[PDB]
């Protein structure tokens, strides 16, 4: 075990008081992924 890796930084994030202190989120976003099945990361 080594406590380090090298992960990439996505170019676009999810972007985003009154009664209830609501959260704000409108736009969707997705990404492509791999599923090497031996130990199962993604």
């Amino acid at each position: 075990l080594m406590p380090v890796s090298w992960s990439r930084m996505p170019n676009h994030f999810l972007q985003v008081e009154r009664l209830g202190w609501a959260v704000q989120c409108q736009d969707p976003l997705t990404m492509m992924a791999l599923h090497i099945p031996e130990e199962n990361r993604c």
Partner: protein
């Protein structure tokens, strides 16, 4: 054998500033309660379903990591052993889900309420649908840090988040004995919503790269009180009376001239006389907590030695501000412990002694069932106002240095 691939959407988690934990010391009650409001109608926007979950997670999550994950993508709450959550039809712990039973049997839908539970003696977590219990409880924990109210959402979500007395209008009545969770806040700032483990934030120039932040721990949230020459025990009342001079100083400004009936509200005081004229528990009231303080002062590591002896009486009092005189004849007059500008260590030694006083009283309050309910936190974690009075009050007692 091969390397399969597919498309995964994104998810993010949000938690409040509150921090609850159980340890030897100030641990509140271990009984907390909150609800939430959901009004989202987008089940299949952009192919896959819209992930929505709520629950608890301990303070070693590090889950967010926007992007890749373990099962499929950088998922949210419930897919680990450091977070416990609910979706509406399943319980998630360790990335594996099990169905639940309830009247209605539908996952989170718009215009709905879910109620969570916390009880750290059994310790176990239960959940409650809008008006009915959810038949399932987590048990056998390993509580070592603190806990987050965590929420999970994919996209296109405008959930309102309910807290309580601040503004959260509790639709339903909490079960018997549960703090509304607004009381537990860091008493040094306000409360707000922030994303956990954020490492990029927006700004006027744009992106801002931020490194790891700081956090408390179980040991930190626990007050801990600190562990003969003739002149040390010879002064006693001489320092006590010098301290007792100030006992009326601003109580003249309060207008409390020796109230014989202890007027707690109509501005009078019953212990505003000389030591012998004082009631029975009034001599050690200003000496026992001071004599032990001087006795403990050797353990403080200070470099002090009573060797001034400047005529042994040059410490002159300051008096005569108009009448200023009572029925007792005290006419309070603090001595000449004014021209003592202390030492760099004494600037902190007085504070260190003040920290001990707050901690010692905290242990006394904790002994009686945490002050027996009905509001003081550990030293260096408490508010700013309390940090002001305790310095000046102990300073006058400490200003006797280089005087005796």
């Amino acid at each position: 054998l091969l390397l399969q691939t597919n498309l995964i959407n994104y998810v993010t988690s949000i938690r409040p500033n509150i921090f609850v934990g159980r340890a030897e010391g100030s641990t509140q009650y271990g009984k907390w309660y909150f609800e939430v409001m959901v009004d989202e109608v987008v089940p299949f926007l952009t192919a896959q379903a819209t992930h929505l979950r709520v629950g608890w997670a301990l303070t070693e999550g590090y889950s967010p990591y926007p992007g890749g994950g373990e099962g499929w993508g950088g998922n949210g709450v419930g897919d680990d052993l450091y977070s416990y959550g609910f979706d509406g039809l399943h319980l998630w712990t360790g990335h594996v889900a099990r169905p639940v039973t309830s009247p209605g049997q539908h996952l989170l839908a718009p215009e709905d309420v879910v109620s969570c539970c916390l009880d750290l003696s059994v310790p176990s977590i239960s959940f409650r649908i809008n008006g009915c219990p959810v038949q399932g409880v987590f048990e056998a924990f390993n509580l070592d840090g603190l806990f987050f109210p965590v929420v999970s959402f994919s996209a296109g979500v405008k959930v309102r988040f309910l807290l309580g007395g601040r503004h959260g209008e509790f639709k339903f009545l909490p079960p018997p004995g549960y703090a509304p969770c607004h009381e537990a806040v860091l008493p040094r700032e306000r409360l707000r919503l922030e994303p956990i483990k954020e490492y990029r934030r927006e700004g006027p120039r744009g992106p801002h790269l931020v490194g790891p932040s700081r956090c408390l721990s179980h040991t930190d949230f626990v007050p801990c009180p600190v562990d003969l020459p003739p002149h040390l025990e010879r002064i006693r009342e001489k320092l006590a009376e010098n301290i007792h001079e100030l006992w009326a100083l601003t109580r003249i400004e309060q207008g409390w001239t020796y109230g014989p009936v202890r007027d707690d509200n109509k501005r009078l005081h019953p212990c505003l006389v000389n030591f012998h004229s004082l009631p029975e528990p009034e001599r050690n009231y200003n000496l026992q907590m001071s004599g032990e303080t001087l006795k403990t002062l050797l353990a403080l590591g200070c470099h002090v030695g009573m060797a001034d002896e400047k005529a042994e009486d040059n410490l002159k009092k300051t008096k005569l501000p108009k009448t200023y005189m009572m029925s007792n004849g005290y006419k309070p007059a603090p001595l000449d412990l004014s021209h003592v500008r202390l030492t760099p260590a004494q600037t902190t030694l007085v504070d260190r002694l003040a920290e001990n006083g707050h901690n010692v009283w905290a242990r006394d309050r904790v002994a009686q069932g945490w002050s027996y309910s009905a509001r003081l936190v550990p030293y260096r974690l408490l508010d700013e106002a309390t940090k002001r009075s305790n310095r000046d009050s102990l300073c006058q007692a400490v200003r006797t240095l280089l005087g005796y």
